Design a protein around this ligand. Structure first.
Ligand SMILES: *[C@@H]1O[C@H](CO)[C@@H](O[C@@H]2O[C@H](CO)[C@@H](O[C@@H]3O[C@H](CO)[C@@H](O)[C@H](O)[C@@H]3O)[C@H](O)[C@H]2NC(C)=O)[C@H](O)[C@H]1NC(C)=O
Ligand SMILES: *[C@@H]1O[C@H](CO[C@@H]2O[C@@H](C)[C@@H](O)[C@@H](O)[C@@H]2O)[C@@H](O[C@@H]2O[C@H](CO)[C@@H](O)[C@H](O)[C@H]2NC(C)=O)[C@H](O)[C@H]1NC(C)=O
Ligand SMILES: *[C@@H]1O[C@H](CO)[C@@H](O[C@@H]2O[C@H](CO)[C@@H](O)[C@H](O)[C@H]2NC(C)=O)[C@H](O)[C@H]1NC(C)=O
Lengths: 114, 199, 242, 117
């Protein structure tokens, strides 16, 4: 059901943010809840994800480094970002994939400066 | 007298720009260009004549060399329809046209809202092959062939299921009965780690 | 391309049978040219004929003949057991004053070594996943046309009996199963996904026919199951609810 | 589409060992099975051997049990580990890469192996 992202903003490289994401609707759908990200003049690509059948999985180079997690209520979902590089600057999205399709969030803009 | 057209292949995503280029040593009068989508033959795209000339004919903009040496065919914002094998040509060595090897463009679509899943399809008729669908995922997933020889998996097509303006990558694999289930169909591909396999 | 016609669209024969591929053009143009374009390559020009009774060789051309008489007809003919011609046969005319060539719609020819090996395709319509129906709310039937050789089939799909081209994706080219062989038999799949709302409506007959182009009459046929004439084959299902 | 530059090759005195690498680039999630052929001054392409992805391995009359083909998913180099020569065997060895989606074949530049006594 409808996701409401929060918690974007600018940092300087080296930075710390944490992107966060409220929810409504099925916590007895789930299936996986991942961030992905929208690098302008790119499409989307996966950054984080936590599956219910498998652990958490990462990818992009934004391994060793940010961390996905999510709460006992499954009413919130957060994406730490640690050691930002300016490479990262982008609209991150989040999706929570259930049984009755994926829903997505509006996104929130991150800036990651030189 | 040969034109070499380079790239040999290009991919690029929907809406981005690209460019191909076609070059030779020796000028030609004319240079012409054709898009040829498989089992229809090469449809003339435009014919350029004069030096540095540029036509634009829609998305395509095409530009001939100043000493008429090579020509470039840029398209601005590719679209699925822009898919196909772009061959250059030119005047022969008595009149017989001389083709470049021709750049296979492949534009892939911008799936936004990717939701990769494989699901199993199946019938209540007779056929004894049960084929599982891997769909909607994103256009950078490359769906590898199996190392069972009684899968078979298909290659990504995109669909254009207009009027919702949804385009959607697919492949199907099946394997000969074997006694195979879904999961393991695409155990050899690197698939997304959010692919919803269903119970 | 132009207003040039060549037919028939496909043609088949056993090896060591001659056949003529016809081209005629209604626009007046003077140089005529025919193309084999082998899979996933470029074109070779076999023979052109600039104007009439003049004909001169192309890049390839050993092993066929075309005679010219008329400016409105061009016969390509193949003289068998050559280097195993089969490729996609494409004719082109121009009016020689700049050389800008238009071309045919084209002729696939397949020559088989044997002739037993030919069969027409089964096919099946695989009715959609109740999972993909719940989670995407579209609904993909796949029609699986398997089995058949040669690769000349034209699969279209016809739902409530009028043919659609909307969200149908047919593998463009067919999967050669057993590639390492020649005379392997092929399958092609094609998808038609309509909305979910539509496969749930038990009224609709999709169905998915596939032309099959195939054995003439006066080949021989001694084996023991149907003899595989061009024929159509379908499969078909209803939508069903849920 | 994919494109497989072969690797390695020249000149070798009888019973010697050569190791054709084929280095497969490109999309090569396609490719069914890979193989080596060879095609000599005089002849049409004889198949040599094959390996499919997932790892078996036929072969093919010629040198059956004495070339061993192998292959390394890591580098997508497929190797032809031709531990045994005789002059019979000088042929342009080309690697092949055969997919049931289309076009069914690619093929690659080629290499000479040449065996001189
Ligand atoms: C992809 O390649 C094309 C053409 O090779 C690039 O197009 C050219 O880019 C410049 C800068 O945007 C354009 O200049 C603009 O011109 C007008 C004056 O006519 C003005 O109002 C603007 O403020 C700006 O200075 C030029 O016209 C343009 N040509 C085209 C085809 O639009 C292009 O930017 C690349 N496009 C994308 C979307 O990637
Ligand atoms: C999927 O693959 C493409 C193409 O890569 C090649 O074939 C693959 C099946 C696999 O064997 C690759 O390792 C091969 O190189 C990947 O695109 C590559 O991506 C990197 C990083 O962005 C880039 O530097 C390369 O040049 C790419 N090659 C091309 C032709 O684009 C693609 O990103 C893969 N996607 C995934 C997620 O696997
Ligand atoms: C089709 O044409 C080919 C080539 O013209 C035929 O082979 C020739 O037949 C003639 C007439 O009998 C001989 O004199 C030639 O020596 C043959 N030429 C070659 C290249 O073999 C072939 O017989 C014809 N086939 C059929 C089925 O009609």
């Amino acid at each position: 059901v409808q996701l409401v992202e929060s918690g974007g903003g600018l940092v300087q490289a080296g930075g710390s943010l944490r992107l966060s994401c409220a929810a409504s609707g099925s916590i007895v759908g789930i299936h996986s809840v991942g961030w992905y990200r929208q690098v302008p003049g790119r499409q989307r690509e996966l950054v984080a994800t936590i599956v219910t059948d498998t652990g958490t999985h990462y990818r992009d180079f934004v391994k060793g480094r940010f961390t996905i997690s999510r709460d006992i209520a499954k009413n919130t979902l957060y994406l730490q970002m640690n050691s930002l590089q300016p490479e990262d600057t982008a609209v991150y999205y989040c999706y929570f994939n259930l049984i009755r399709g994926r829903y997505w969030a509006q996104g929130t803009l991150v800036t990651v400066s030189s | 007298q040969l034109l070499e057209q380079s790239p040999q292949f290009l991919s690029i995503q929907e809406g981005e720009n690209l460019t191909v280029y076609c070059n030779s040593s020796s000028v030609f009068s004319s240079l012409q260009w054709y898009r040829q989508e498989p089992g229809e033959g090469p449809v003339l795209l435009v014919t350029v004549v004069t030096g540095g000339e540029v036509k634009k004919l829609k998305r395509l903009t095409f530009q001939f060399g100043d000493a008429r040496k090579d020509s470039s065919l840029h398209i601005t914002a590719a679209q699925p329809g822009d898919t196909g094998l772009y061959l250059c040509a030119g005047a022969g060595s008595q009149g017989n046209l001389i083709f470049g090897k021709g750049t296979k463009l492949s534009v892939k679509p911008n799936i936004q809202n990717p939701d990769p899943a494989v699901y199993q399809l199946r019938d209540s008729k007779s056929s004894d092959k049960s084929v599982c669908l891997f769909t909607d995922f994103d256009s950078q997933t490359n769906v590898s062939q199996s190392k069972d020889s009684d899968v078979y998996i298909t290659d990504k097509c995109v669909l254009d299921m207009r009027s919702m303006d949804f385009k959607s990558n697919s492949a199907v694999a099946w394997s000969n009965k074997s006694d195979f289930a879904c999961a393991n169909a695409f155990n050899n591909s690197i698939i997304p780690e959010d692919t919803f396999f269903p119970s | 391309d132009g207003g040039i016609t060549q037919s028939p669209k496909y043609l088949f024969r056993k090896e060591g049978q001659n056949v003529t591929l016809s081209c005629e053009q209604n626009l007046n143009h003077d140089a005529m040219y025919w193309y084999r374009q082998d899979p996933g390559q470029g074109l070779r020009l076999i023979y052109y004929s600039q104007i009439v009774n003049d004909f001169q060789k192309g890049d390839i051309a050993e092993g066929y003949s075309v005679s010219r008489e008329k400016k409105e007809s061009f016969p390509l003919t193949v003289t068998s057991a050559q280097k195993n011609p089969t490729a996609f046969y494409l004719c082109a005319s121009s009016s020689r004053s700049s050389y800008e060539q238009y071309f045919g719609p084209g002729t696939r020819l397949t020559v088989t070594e044997d002739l037993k090996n030919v069969f027409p395709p089964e096919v099946a319509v695989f009715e959609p996943s109740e999972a993909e129906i719940s989670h995407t709310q579209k609904a993909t039937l796949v029609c699986l046309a398997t089995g058949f050789y040669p690769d000349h089939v034209e699969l279209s799909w016809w739902v409530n009996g009028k043919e659609v081209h909307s969200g149908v994706c047919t593998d463009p080219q067919p999967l050669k199963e057993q590639p390492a062989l020649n005379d392997s038999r092929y399958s092609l799949s094609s998808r038609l996904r309509v909305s979910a709302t539509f496969w749930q409506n038990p009224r609709n007959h999709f169905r998915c026919q596939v032309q099959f182009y195939g054995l003439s009459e006066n080949d021989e046929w001694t084996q023991d199951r149907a003899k595989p004439v061009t024929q159509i084959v379908s499969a078909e299902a209803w939508g069903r609810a849920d | 589409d994919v494109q497989l530059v072969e690797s390695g090759g020249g000149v070798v005195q009888p019973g010697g060992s050569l190791r054709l690498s084929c280095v497969a680039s490109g999309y090569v999630h396609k490719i069914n099975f890979y193989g080596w052929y060879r095609q000599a001054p005089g002849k049409e392409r004889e198949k040599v051997a094959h390996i499919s992805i997932g790892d078996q391995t036929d072969y093919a009359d010629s040198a059956k049990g004495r070339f061993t083909i192998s292959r390394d998913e890591s580098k997508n180099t497929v190797y032809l580990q031709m531990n045994s020569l005789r002059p019979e065997d000088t042929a342009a060895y080309y690697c092949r890469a055969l997919s049931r989606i289309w076009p069914y074949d690619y093929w690659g530049q080629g290499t000479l192996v040449t065996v001189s006594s």
